[PDB]
Design a protein around this ligand. Structure first.
Ligand SMILES: Nc1ncnc2c1ncn2[C@@H]1O[C@H](COP(=O)(O)OP(=O)(O)O)[C@@H](O)[C@H]1O
Ligand SMILES: [Mg+2]
Length: 164
């Protein structure tokens, strides 16, 4: 129930995934991503992230999809203990509303699509700046569902794409 406690739980479970099991779960999920973006050609700049503690991985055929449809990928970079910004491969910084879609990493999400991160709350602060109704999409493994209650500052997220 408690955020901190829930983090620890899920965190331990995700670090148990088999190298083969995980690669399969990631395949199902990446396929959905491609399925999600196909009928949305107005998404030309998209925010991704660099998989860290056994987070869902973006695979090769996903990056090929973006490459072939000319969809630019931007990644997060921290500047302070509270601020995060996004940049493209050539280190060019993209403002919040220059991005059309956000694939957000997470440790947990509940039934109302709220998400749980590592605590600093970078995304809660950042996502609050969006003014173009950009989809806010959490990326996760089915078992990352958890029963915690959202705090007043938590940005809700439009959807949670997982292995199902
Ligand atoms: N928009 C905001 N303005 C000021 N502080 C914020 C804002 N959003 C989040 N925070 C702070 O960031 C921290 C995020 O905590 P929490 O939501 O539990 O983390 P996480 O999103 O990583 O699971 C909280 O201490 C909260 O007060
Ligand atoms: Mg939060």
């Amino acid at each position: 129930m408690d955020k901190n406690a829930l983090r620890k739980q899920i965190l331990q479970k995700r670090m148990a995934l088999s190298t083969i099991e995980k690669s399969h779960l990631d395949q199902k999920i990446n396929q959905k991503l491609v399925a999600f973006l196909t009928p949305k050609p107005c998404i030309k700049t998209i925010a991704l992230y660099e998989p860290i503690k056994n987070e869902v991985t973006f695979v090769d055929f996903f990056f090929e999809f973006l490459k072939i449809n000319q969809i630019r990928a931007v990644y997060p970079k921290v500047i302070s203990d509270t601020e995060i910004i996004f940049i493209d491969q050539e280190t060019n910084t993209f403002e919040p509303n220059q991005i059309d879609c956000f694939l957000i990493p997470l440790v947990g999400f509940n039934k109302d699509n709220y998400r749980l991160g590592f605590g600093k709350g970078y995304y809660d602060r950042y996502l609050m700046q969006l003014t173009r109704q950009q989809p806010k999409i959490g990326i996760a493994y089915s078992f990352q569902k958890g029963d915690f209650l959202a705090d007043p500052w938590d940005v809700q997220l439009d959807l949670i794409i997982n292995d199902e």
